[PDB]
Amino acid sequence: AKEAYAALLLAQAFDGPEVVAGAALGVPPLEGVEAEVENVWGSKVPRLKATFPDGALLSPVGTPAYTLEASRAFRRYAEALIRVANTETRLKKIGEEIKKTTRRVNALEQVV
């Protein structure tokens, strides 16, 4: 990622200022979080794919240049973030059970 971020600053650190307008809006910013159930023992919680694009093309010529490839990097934020977004929601499931579980384990073993 960090490539592009840093390649902002190249000839467009200064045109970050420009860019933040100048490239910004070819796509809905924000949400598209399409909440997903994974339904198992380990109940149901929301996961999601925020399945709306994060876009990157909206400008012509390839305009100022750094922009397009860099904006293309944003993809590789979005998409990638999903893996972890969805594995950790599984984590939270996996916490619960174990914890809860043992609570009863204990109880049975330790009073009943």
Binding site: K2, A4, Y5, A6, L8, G16, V19, V20, A23, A24, G26, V27, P28, P29, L30, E31, G32, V33, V45, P46, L48, A50, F52, P53, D54, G55, A56, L58, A70, S71, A73, F74, Y77, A78, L81, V84, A85, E88, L91, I94, G95, I98, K99
Partner: protein, 100 residues
């Protein structure tokens, strides 16, 4: 989204089809804390670990059993993150777990 990172570098992400807005002056992410609750929902939610936020119990104390979209903490630029991966691994594995 709802991101913060290094603000300036978060900036790029947030531009196309994405979203963040917080700034560096709450290094615990007040920057998220309130903001999150401002709608109570965003595409997702993420952070710099600089903006120290796995005190997400802070967040939980507001959310109160709400399923907010929740962090990915980030160091905002390369400088070896693989620690808090294998650590992120420990973050369950020590403490959700028979693992220690």
């Amino acid at each position: 989204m709802a991101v913060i990172a290094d603000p300036e570098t978060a900036q790029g992400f947030r531009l196309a089809g994405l979203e963040g807005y917080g700034a560096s002056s709450a290094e615990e992410a007040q920057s998220l804390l309130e903001t999150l609750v401002e709608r109570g929902g965003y595409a997702l939610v993420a952070v710099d670990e600089a903006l120290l936020p796995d005190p997400e119990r802070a967040v939980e104390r507001l959310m109160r059993g709400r399923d907010l979209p929740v962090l990915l903490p980030i160091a905002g630029l390369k400088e070896a993150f693989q620690g808090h991966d294998v650590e992120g691994y420990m973050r369950e594995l020590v403490r959700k777990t028979i693992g220690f």
